[PDB]
Each structure stands twice: as C-alpha cells, then as structure tokens.
Ligand binder design. Structure first.
Ligand SMILES: N=C(N)c1ccc(Oc2ccc(-c3nc4cc(C(=N)N)ccc4[nH]3)cc2)cc1
Ligand SMILES: N=C(N)c1ccc(Oc2ccc(-c3nc4cc(C(=N)N)ccc4[nH]3)cc2)cc1
Lengths: 255, 255
DNA sequence: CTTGAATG
DNA sequence: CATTCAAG
DNA sequence: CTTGAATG
DNA sequence: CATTCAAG
C-alpha cells in the first residue's frame, strides 16, 4: 500500500510537481543571438481539437501562460495509432541553435550501470512523471519558448509560453539531471549503504536486503515528494529481485 | 634532311617495325585461369566497313593471322569526329583478369623528368610508331587474344589473333618499356654524356650542346632503326632548345 | 557494347 | 538509385 | 511541417 | 538526386 503511505510522492495522488528547492532557471543565449520568430503553419481543425485539451490543462496548471514575445517557434500535431490521440510537439530547433551550449553531464546508461555492485540485488525502479515541468524557468527566460495558439473559433490573444523547463529544449535533460542530483545529495549522504543511480528521470535504488530496500524506498519516496517531484505509481517497480531499467533487465546481478 | 639520312629509323620510310633482338613474348596466366569465350555483339555494316581496311592492313602486315582459339573477346567500333573514322578496339578486360600480374616498372612522368640535368638543354623528342606491334608474341600466347571477324558478306573462317603485343592488354606498356630498355642499354653505355629518358614509346634525348645533340640523335636514330623500331618523322622534334614531352614544355631547363 | 567508378 | 564518364 | 542524415 | 527515417 505504498500508494497510501506516500500520497505526496506519487503522480497519481500528489498532483503536478514543482521542485521547490530549485531556483527558477535562467537560460543563457549565445553571444550573438537575436530573437527569431517562425510563422506557425496553419493547423487543421482536427489537429487543433486534438491538441486543445492538453493546452487547457497546462494553462490551468500554470505551466503555460499567455505572453507577447519576439520569439516564436511552431507547434506540431503528432499522433501515433490512428488519426486520433494528438499531443503538442514544439519545434525548438531554431531556439536551440541560439542558446549557449552546456557540458553534457548525463552518463550513458552503460557507464551508469557499472556502478551497481553484485552485493546489492534488491532493486526499486521509479520514473519521475513530467520531470522537466517540475523545474521552474526564470521569467526572463520564459519568452524564449513562446508559440502561437488559436482556438477553433476564438481563443487567447496570440502567444503562450512555458513557465517550466520545456520538452524539445536541447538542455532540458542535462539541467534536470543536474538539478535532481543537487536535491538528492543529502539523501545519498543519509543512506551510505544504498546505491542510487540517476538517469534524468529514471531512478534505480539498490540495497543489500529486502528490508533495506523497503526502508530505502520509503525514505526516497518521502524525500522526492517533499522536494516536489512525482513518481509513477503505475510503472513503479518496488523492492524486486528483477527489474527493467533503461532498457535492461536487471536479474541475478547481471548487467 | 634526317628523313633521308635515316630511312630505316622513320615509320614513314622504314615500314612496320619488328624488334629483331627481342624473343617472342610468352604471357603467363594466373594459376587457376581457364579460357573464356565472350560472344561478339553484332556489328552494324557501317562499323564493319569502317573497321575492315584496318583489319586487312594488319593481315597483310602479318600482325593479325587466322586462328581457332578457346579464347575470344569482343571487338568494338570506336569513332570520334563524326559517324566516320572508325578503328578496332578490343575489350581485353576478361583476358587481363586471367593473366598473371607483373610489377609496374614504368616511372611516372614526374619522377622520370627529375633525371634531367640543367646542363643538358639541347633536346630531341621522338615517339615510336606502333610500338607494341614491334614486339612479337610467342605462338603459345597468341591464342589468348583472339576475336571474331566477319566480312560484310563473306570473309575469313572465324577468328583472328595478334602475332604482336596487342593494344588493350594490361601488361603491354610495361613489357614494351622493359624491352626497349634492354635494347638501348648499349647505346647508353656508348654515350655516357647523353641523357636518355624513356616512357614506353616516348623518348627524350638531352645533350650539352647542339653538336652533341645532332651527333646523339643521328646515333639514336641509327640504333633504333637497326633494332627494328620506328619513330614518327612527322612528330619528331630534333635538336630543339624547346620541346614538348609527356605533356610538359621543356624550356630553359624548366620542368 | 559492357564495366566500374564517380556524381547527382 | 538513375546518369555520366572513362576505358577496354 | 520542416530539417539533416542515411539509403538507394 | 529522389526517398525514407528521425526528430523537434
Ligand atoms: N542523375 C543525374 N541527373 C546526373 C548524375 C551525375 C552527373 O555527373 C558526373 C558523372 C560522372 C563523372 C566521372 N566519372 C568518372 C569515372 C572514372 C573511372 N573509374 N575511370 C574517372 C573520372 C570520372 N568522372 C563526373 C560528373 C550528371 C547528371
Ligand atoms: N530512392 C528510393 N526509392 C529509396 C531510397 C532509400 C530507402 O531506405 C532508407 C532511408 C533512410 C534510413 C535512415 N535515415 C536515418 C536518419 C538518422 C538521423 N540523422 N537522425 C538516423 C538513422 C536513419 N536511418 C534507412 C533506410 C528506400 C527507398
């Protein structure tokens, strides 16, 4: 009943996250960058109706807010199964090109897994839901990610932008990984015997026994919830001898 | 009047050459080679009539002879200006593939020219006419180069082959260059002060003065004629301060 | 004419 | 993968 | 829909 | 140089 013991740590019961200890992120531009405003290609009504619910939800959550900005990038309608199930995908390539590069600090899965001792075979895998959205963007950097939004007949003035780290931004994975490392530094210190692997929003906790794993998981969930992050209860793999992590199947200490 | 003083050395007056000091060449095949007989693609009457005179001339010269061989490669009709001026071109690629490779001993023009001292600025350039044809092919190797020949209505039985080193054969340049080097070895020894460069059928004689060049040229022409080779009187550049050799313009010792 | 390599 | 070039 | 890279 | 893939 981990779902009930840690209501705040799960996406299904704690609501949208917000990393309260992390200062709003400022995104430095390259020395010669000037705003670029790309025209929004006309979107069919089908695509707009498919996207609308997502946009409204983000607006209600305060993740998207109205704005007037010199920057503008196109929104794209992306589906998968049939001509249904849409979801907003912003093409931030022209923005990415104008943002100063940062060093890629996220380890590749292969090297990350090398830090898992055979002594720790009790695993717990958690994936953080809407991880990037948990990190606030400083108001000065918000205008950079603006896009146009029109309702199938009459909607908001013109542009909308993100108040949190957006999908499609080249530095989101690295900035998120670095932010969570800062937030989980104390947890690591308070649990010397535990092994914690972080790959952006995918976490692997390893303990020597089933007890230390349940104790560790309880503490990690409590810490994450308190910090403002949210894990997927649905996909969560708690205290298992075998788990799926980063495309690998961890079993008998293999891999 | 070099044309009259050396009748035997010029192609225009000495007739078709024949390297009398060189033993008929035997062409070794690769260890696993077996004869290949490629069908002759039908040739238009236009092409056949264009080729016929050349074939008859070679037959009269004994350069081509009738034969029955397990080997056969295609003859091609090649023209240049208009739909006129034809000339037989044999595709010996399938034969080349089955012949043992030999080391490429012909120097590249750049390196060959490095052996020309500034002290020798009186040049003479001669190109040997139908050079390969001057080298006999041993009867055992003649069948290898056979091709089919049909007259525009009624001609020779079937196949014809070469009795001399043929054009299109991968080793002809090297074998010719090596043969002429053997034949001109004594000339080099008898004329220590002369510079002689050989690039297959293109010869460059260099002397310190105009006299040594005329003396040297006279001796070279006499030697070549006696050996059975023939130079082009038309293209000959005798005792000049400036000459064209291997695409270069030799002048003032430059190049 | 058929082959291979070099370009679009 | 379709054309162009080069070559025998 | 637009971009670049990878394939034919 | 025309298609296909991948991605934002
Ligand atoms: N698809 C198309 N419309 C086109 C595709 C390619 C085009 O141009 C060219 C095609 C081929 C060459 C070219 N091909 C070769 C082959 C060589 C060899 N291997 N002997 C040696 C040198 C050489 N140059 C040069 C230019 C023109 C049009
Ligand atoms: N001209 C034609 N008829 C055809 C030409 C090419 C064909 O196939 C293919 C085309 C393209 C790919 C292919 N393209 C990419 C791009 C990648 C990237 N840069 N992100 C990463 C991986 C990748 N695989 C794989 C196969 C099929 C037909």
């Amino acid at each position: 009943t981990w779902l009930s013991d840690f209501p705040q740590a799960w996406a299904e019961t704690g609501g949208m996250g917000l990393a309260v200890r992390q200062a709003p992120l400022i995104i430095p531009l390259k020395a010669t960058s000037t705003p670029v405003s790309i025209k929004q290609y006309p979107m069919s009504q089908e695509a707009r109706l498919g996207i609308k619910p997502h946009i409204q939800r983000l607006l209600d959550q305060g993740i998207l807010v109205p704005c007037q900005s010199p920057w503008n990038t196109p929104l794209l309608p992306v589906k998968k199964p049939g001509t249904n199930d849409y979801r907003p995908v912003q093409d931030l390539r022209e923005v990415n090109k104008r943002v100063e590069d940062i060093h890629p600090t996220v380890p590749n899965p292969y090297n990350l897994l090398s830090g898992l001792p055979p002594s720790h075979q009790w695993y717990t895998v958690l994936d953080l839901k809407d991880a990037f959205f948990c990190l606030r963007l400083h108001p000065t950097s918000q205008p950079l990610f603006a896009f146009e939004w029109r309702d199938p007949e009459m909607g908001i003035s013109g542009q909308l932008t993100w108040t949190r780290l957006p999908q499609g931004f080249k530095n989101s994975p690295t900035l998120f990984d670095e932010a969570l490392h800062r937030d989980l530094a104390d947890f690591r210190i308070q649990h010397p015997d535990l092994i914690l692997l972080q790959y952006v929003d995918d976490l692997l906790l390893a303990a020597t026994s089933e007890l230390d794993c349940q104790q560790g998981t309880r503490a990690l969930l409590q810490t994450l919830g308190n910090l403002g992050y949210r894990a997927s209860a649905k996909k969560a793999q708690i205290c298992q001898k075998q788990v799926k992590y980063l495309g690998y199947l961890l079993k008998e200490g293999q891999r």
